Design a protein around this ligand. Sequence first.
Ligand SMILES: OC[C@H]1O[C@H](OC[C@H]2O[C@H](OC[C@H]3O[C@H](O)[C@@H](O)[C@@H](O)[C@@H]3O)[C@@H](O)[C@@H](O[C@H]3O[C@H](CO)[C@@H](O)[C@H](O)[C@@H]3O)[C@@H]2O)[C@@H](O)[C@@H](O)[C@@H]1O
Ligand SMILES: OC[C@H]1O[C@H](O[C@@H]2[C@H](O)[C@@H](O)O[C@H](CO)[C@H]2O)[C@@H](O)[C@@H](O)[C@@H]1O
Ligand code: CA
Ligand code: CA
Ligand code: MN
Ligand code: MN
Lengths: 240, 240
Amino acid sequence: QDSLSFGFPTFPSDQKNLIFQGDAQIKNNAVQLTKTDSNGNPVASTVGRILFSAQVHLWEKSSSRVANFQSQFSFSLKSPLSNGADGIAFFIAPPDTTIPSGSGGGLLGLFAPGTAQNTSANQVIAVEFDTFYAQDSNTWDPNYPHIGIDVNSIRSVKTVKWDRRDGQSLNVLVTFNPSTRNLDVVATYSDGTRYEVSYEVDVRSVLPEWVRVGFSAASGEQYQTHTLESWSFTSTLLYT
Amino acid sequence: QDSLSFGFPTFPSDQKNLIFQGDAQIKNNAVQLTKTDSNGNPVASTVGRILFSAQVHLWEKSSSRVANFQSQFSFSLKSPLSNGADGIAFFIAPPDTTIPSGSGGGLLGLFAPGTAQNTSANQVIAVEFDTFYAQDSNTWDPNYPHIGIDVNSIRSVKTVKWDRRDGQSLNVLVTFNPSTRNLDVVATYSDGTRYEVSYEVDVRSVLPEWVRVGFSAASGEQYQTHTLESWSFTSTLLYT
Ligand SMILES: OC[C@H]1O[C@H](OC[C@H]2O[C@H](OC[C@H]3O[C@H](O)[C@@H](O)[C@@H](O)[C@@H]3O)[C@@H](O)[C@@H](O[C@H]3O[C@H](CO)[C@@H](O)[C@H](O)[C@@H]3O)[C@@H]2O)[C@@H](O)[C@@H](O)[C@@H]1O
Ligand SMILES: OC[C@H]1O[C@H](O[C@@H]2[C@H](O)[C@@H](O)O[C@H](CO)[C@H]2O)[C@@H](O)[C@@H](O)[C@@H]1O
Ligand SMILES: [Ca+2]
Ligand SMILES: [Ca+2]
Ligand SMILES: [Mn+2]
Ligand SMILES: [Mn+2]
């Protein structure tokens, strides 16, 4: 299809169009990307991702068209500690993507240790909400919590300082305009606190014509829940 | 997802989200549901169907909601014979639906001979454009080409007279309003000739909560191409 849109205001237990990977599962009408124990507390060493099952036609070589797309979602992070880890990311990747070996912790379930910073070895565009940045293990991160745009590497091409608020939902709008090639991110807390980051990227040189979209989250030694509460997506192929 | 929409203004060869069954295949940017030889001419004894891969959430028991959906599509039929057969149908069925054994010809690839008129034996809602009505073989049909609404049986719950026009595209809009439970069908030719038929049906009593949508066509001893040219579909769950 030239156009595709879907909306999940909540996530009831009987899902048919979601591919669950790792520890991801539905609980209490939300997707819990990382593992929790019996009483709902986050645990260490867990990775989980979900992808929508239908493939998205991102660009078409024969017609020279590229899709405009918009992804809106909300999530909350909760943790007994004050330095919860590691973060959640919205990502776009080839359809057959699976959790890479050793991609836990700061690699967010998106990159393999050996090639995490090698741009020629990956095919992924992700918008990360990164809460852990200790320089001994997350050497690629700025030294503060941040939202970052990742293009084939865990070392973001662009970041903005961000504030983690335990238990508060963050509403996010991610938009890609093929006319300007701008991937824009706007995130807001309910009190109006806003964060914005953008980057120019030609999606045609990074990803294949057909892709899958989804979310990934991980916790290494430090942990927190990564609860995806709602998600809507729309894509339309346009001539530019 | 509570809402899902997709649009195929045309059908390029590179498809990823269509399930092809039987002889259906893409040719010349359209879906040819029934088999054609090398020269693009129709042949006898063929059946084909396509289904969109993502499942549609038609109704939800736990929330007392039912979907409002609209399906817009265009198709054309062509045959050198004076009695081209058998017809094309838009249908909604359980996700695991497959072509029933012996469902060729007048059964349109939707029903098995033994239970074709047994309503308690099927789960399908279909809108048929039926061009073959010989009273000796298609005993359930009215004696003229017609548009029919089929609910668990090849003997339509209702039909309206229709004119088959060789090689001319018919544009069709099928809508279902959960508030009134009306399934409405409006079809038009390019000169403005219009056909309309409506039926009240509680989809919750006929189909499961999650379904797949698609098209089916067949040719028995007489034949014609059944070419699906474009298709858009949208569905959203609403409180009733
Ligand atoms: O795709 C159309 C139709 O094909 C299959 O039905 C076959 C055949 O059934 C009826 O006649 C049976 C036999 O008739 C003769 O003995 C031979 O031609 C033999 O080969 C046939 O099998 C009949 O309905 C027939 O339709 C033709 O004849 C009728 C009546 O003379 C006429 O009104 C029609 O326009 C046509 O010429 C039909 O081909 C099955 O697969 C059906 O489900 C399917 O609808
Ligand atoms: O989840 C945080 C972090 O855990 C793991 O690394 C550890 C941390 O850097 C911190 O606890 O110090 C430890 C000792 O040096 C170190 O092992 C990894 O999974 C890492 O990727 C993750 O960010
Ligand atoms: Ca980090
Ligand atoms: Ca018939
Ligand atoms: Mn980071
Ligand atoms: Mn009929």
